[PDB]
Design a protein around this ligand. Sequence first.
Ligand SMILES: CC(=O)N[C@@H]1[C@@H](O)[C@H](O[C@@H]2O[C@H](CO)[C@@H](O)[C@H](O)[C@H]2NC(C)=O)[C@@H](CO)O[C@H]1O
Length: 368
Amino acid sequence: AKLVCYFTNWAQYRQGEARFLPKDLDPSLCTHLIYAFAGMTNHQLSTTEWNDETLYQEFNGLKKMNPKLKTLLAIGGWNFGTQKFTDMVATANNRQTFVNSAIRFLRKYSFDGLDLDWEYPGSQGSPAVDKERFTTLVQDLANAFQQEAQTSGKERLLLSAAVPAGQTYVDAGYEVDKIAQNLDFVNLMAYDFHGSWEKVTGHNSPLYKRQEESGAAASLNVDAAVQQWLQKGTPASKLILGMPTYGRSFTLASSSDTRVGAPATGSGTPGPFTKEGGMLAYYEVCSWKGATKQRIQDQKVPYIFRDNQWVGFDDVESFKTKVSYLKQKGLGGAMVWALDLDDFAGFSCNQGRYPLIQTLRQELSLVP
Ligand SMILES: CC(=O)N[C@@H]1[C@@H](O)[C@H](O[C@@H]2O[C@H](CO)[C@@H](O)[C@H](O)[C@H]2NC(C)=O)[C@@H](CO)O[C@H]1O
């Protein structure tokens, strides 16, 4: 089993106990640690924060403590958008520039691989031609990594990709069968199924559908996303089930209608540490004062409300349920977004450090 965990290079800017610093990294919590995010300049891999080089040395320095650990560098993410990917994959020449830059960069900073997080080929402004060009990029990287291993005698760089759960994005961007041949593993982003971009409440990461759902909505759940990627050609051993350590929040139209599917007027109030309306870290809801928590019966996940604020999130119980699920489906492991949104310092939830991610590690039988 794998436990793939994302580190984010902006968590260092949160205040107080929420500030995530190198001392908060645990070399043996996860099997694979992915650094979010690198960017791109002139079609070439590049840093995005002023101290990335300092953090790269910390990050890969964990491997001194746990020599089994593998690290990857992720390029892209939601905010990065698509234009730079589109421009880089538009020609073989530009892809070659990128691939060669990536190998040099990963070796320079001692990363064990690259995680592609383009959100997404064929969507978010990216043209339809990018579906096949993404296939080619994946093939180009895999083949070049194989070649460099032969030339250098070093262990081959890994290639993974973070991929969407929703059929609209999957079919617009991903030749699933083809890319599965070349990716070492596939990080399924089985979250953001619902959120405050919708005008009714819905859970960030439900395992199964609700009875009231039909049509496309009935596939906006973890089980459907997993089965989608498997049936479209991803080997189970390569499919890594993503898990969120955050929830998605809504302001209710009325505090007297708190159902799943109740009318919402927008994002929930920003969290005191995360300061982003529409999401909250686990540590911002795990002990939410004066709130009312219950479970969504068929979806196997909790929601919590307080006055006109409503939040769908994951807890220890839902993480256990999801690991039981992934094991039943024979998947390659779990992935988690993100280290810094769990109660990494044990300051809020009275459940110790990393209560959610330690649950994943325990349920996968990966405890040192
Ligand atoms: C692998 C993965 O989940 N990638 C995406 C993430 O970028 C995204 O997290 C969001 O990243 C933004 C930067 O690109 C941040 O500004 C934003 O705060 C952050 N949101 C959260 C809830 O952490 C995650 C989660 O939505 O999903 C992908 O879209």
